[PDB]
Amino acid sequence: GIGAFGLLGFLAAGSKKKNEQELLELDKWASLWN
């Protein structure tokens, strides 16, 4: 309903609505594959 289809932009929502930790969290994007 609004859970599975919401997971498509759940995290992004958190931003749509702080700490740098999160930034570095996404900064690891590369670290993912790297």
From TrEMBL:
This is Gp41. It comes from Human immunodeficiency virus type 1 (HIV-1).
